[PDB]
């Protein structure tokens, strides 16, 4: 599995990448995204995750915002324009290395119910967060429940057990951030009070 | 994450020839109150060595998760033979059930157990004695922490070695965490840690 | 093996926007009748390339898989943003649909189309223009013949290279099996094969 | 995935096999028996294969029963006295090579009704086949239907559609043996007609 402080070796290739895909996020007007392979994707786990990409002419830092069920472990598929950034487009596929980086990023992480969310089922999405995020609870009473993340990223509460409740996340650090306050309002990102540490 | 606490689950209790030994990767045991979970609930490993007290048409009975049951439907529970005659007539070959997850007695620390092989540069953990379901198990790496991930036989690996011979630390379903140290990397040991999971109501 | 032909299936309509490109590895097209098929029933592009009659509130449309829904619950269709507008008011954005897998005219022979990159050592082939859903491919070994496993991209494997360039053989899933000769080990290019699949009434 | 025709490279441990296990398969006398690793063992596809095991100190055939889930693929858990034949069980974990063999065996192929089949449901098992299955299918009017294997080696139809018609079986080699008059009788094997050919 992809770990921090380690270079990985690969192949960089490009698609038509707006931002949508298998992490389910928005259409973004940023070229600096990826889809990642399935086998390091790891049912969501890189979804948002930074990585620094170095190719034949140049290196880009992009975000994972999708998957490559075709790609290779190590493989990266760029979008179009931040490919051209590292590489010649007409070579079409090129040897890359990467690493996980934890760049600068401004503002706390922030929390999306998914749409149809209630207190009687819930999925809760994770945004803007600066390290990859492990693992997501919710508070139910006095002790907390994980909740599971799906392929699609979203971390489901499948019989609504803490839906609107106290949330807390840990990156894969160790470190956990825990937010009062978030309303069970589904499709709208709210901000936490807090973001990881830049490691 | 099927089975949670708080929860009473129907199914159906059928009975194999246990011994202790299974997918869990536990070792054979004269204890008749163990059980294999049926694979949806056992939820790669997530259930190994959970406590589950079992009602069926003859009594109740506690037992511990030690092995896993591919052909059952999510809520079966395949007991061992003794454990079966405890709560249903062992004639009948498949009874109703219903159980929940309990958090019981239990005497003495959390374990730790490195698999066969383990090195610096390679390792498994297996925890062990845990009064309620582990949830994860992290290695200490410098100033932060690295999740290992459990596989279905029940071992957190460390695929590169990172954190093998480091501190550990083990959070519960409940969410509560203990940190261990000075478990040494020696393979096929049981090493006790310090301290217990909360007994929860 | 979720979904048979002759049965109906009901869930939910919603709509994205399509181009043709997606996990079956189809080429874009400016077809309308195209969807994106919920996870489950997709099982590993078992169903890529099927056509399949979605019924809405506005009406029918027949429409081929070209994609995979990851989110979407078992029965649900996420349709592209034209075939939607035929079956119901693209304002709703999510409506209740019915629906079944058809074996409609087309025209011509299956196709197939080997992987970029492939050689002796290792190979994929795609069926194209197929007029049911495809259960297996397989190549000729000499006397025998070895399965390609399928996988989710929508490409049968040969993982080391075996039957790369040989006799093919596919399988829809009504159990009528075609055989198809001189297919080059040219990878990017669709050949004809020699017919098509029954039409099933 | 393994192939006939090929040498694999692995390690033989040992449990206490006794014919019970992954592939629900009956109690046996035999001691040619094994477990083999979770990757080769392929969603029950290596069910039932005959493995000629050859370790440091003797080779012996052995039959697939079970599935490893620790062992790494190449790996064969042995029954306790088949690897008494091959190693030294003092030893306890021992280089092993091994092949996919067609050998003798008597016999047509017969089928399994689990228990609990009825016209609204059944799954379907085959016994005292030569060479691994690949496929299973029931007849349906003018049509047949594949039915899916599951990991405890049963093809199951969920719907009962085709419980007690004609059956069909294709090993690995590609050869197709069609079967009528196996009767919808639940925990009975049942003789086919034929058996794959020995290769």
């Given at each position: 599995?992809v770990?921090?402080?380690?270079?990985?070796?690969?192949?960089?290739?490009?698609?038509?990448?707006?931002?949508?895909?298998?992490?389910?996020?928005?259409?973004?007007?940023d070229?600096?995204?990826?889809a990642?392979?399935?086998?390091?994707?790891?049912?969501?786990?890189?979804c948002?995750?930074?990585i620094?990409?170095?190719?034949?002419?140049?290196?880009?830092?992009?975000?994972?915002?999708?998957?490559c069920?075709?790609?290779?472990?190590?493989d990266?598929?760029?979008?179009?324009?931040?490919?051209?950034?590292?590489?010649?487009?007409?070579?079409?596929?090129?040897?890359?290395?990467?690493?996980?980086?934890?760049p600068?990023?401004?503002?706390?992480?922030s929390?999306?119910?998914?749409?149809?969310?209630?207190?009687?089922?819930?999925?809760?999405?994770?945004?803007?967060?600066?390290?990859?995020?492990?693992?997501?609870?919710?508070?139910?009473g006095?002790?907390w429940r994980?909740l599971?993340?799906?392929?699609?990223?979203?971390?489901?509460?499948a019989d609504?057990?803490?839906?609107?409740?106290?949330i807390?996340?840990?990156?894969?650090?160790?470190?956990?951030?825990?937010?009062?306050?978030?309303?069970?309002?589904?499709?709208?990102?709210?901000?936490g009070?807090?973001?990881?540490?830049?490691?």
């Amino acid at each position: 599995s992809v770990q921090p402080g380690v270079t990985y070796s690969g192949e960089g290739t490009f698609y038509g990448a707006t931002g949508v895909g298998n992490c389910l996020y928005d259409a973004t007007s940023d070229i600096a995204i990826a889809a990642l392979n399935h086998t390091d994707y790891d049912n969501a786990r890189m979804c948002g995750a930074f990585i620094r990409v170095k190719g034949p002419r140049g290196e880009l830092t992009v975000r994972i915002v999708d998957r490559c069920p075709e790609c290779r472990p190590g493989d990266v598929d760029l979008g179009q324009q931040a490919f051209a950034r590292i590489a010649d487009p007409v070579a079409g596929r090129v040897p890359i290395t990467w690493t996980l980086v934890s760049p600068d990023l401004a503002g706390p992480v922030s929390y999306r119910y998914k749409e149809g969310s209630t207190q009687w089922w819930c999925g809760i999405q994770v945004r803007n967060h600066r390290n990859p995020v492990a693992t997501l609870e919710v508070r139910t009473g006095t002790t907390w429940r994980q909740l599971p993340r799906q392929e699609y990223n979203y971390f489901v509460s499948a019989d609504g057990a803490g839906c609107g409740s106290d949330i807390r996340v840990k990156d894969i650090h160790g470190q956990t951030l825990t937010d009062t306050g978030i309303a069970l309002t589904p499709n709208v990102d709210q901000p936490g009070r807090a973001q990881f540490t830049k490691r």
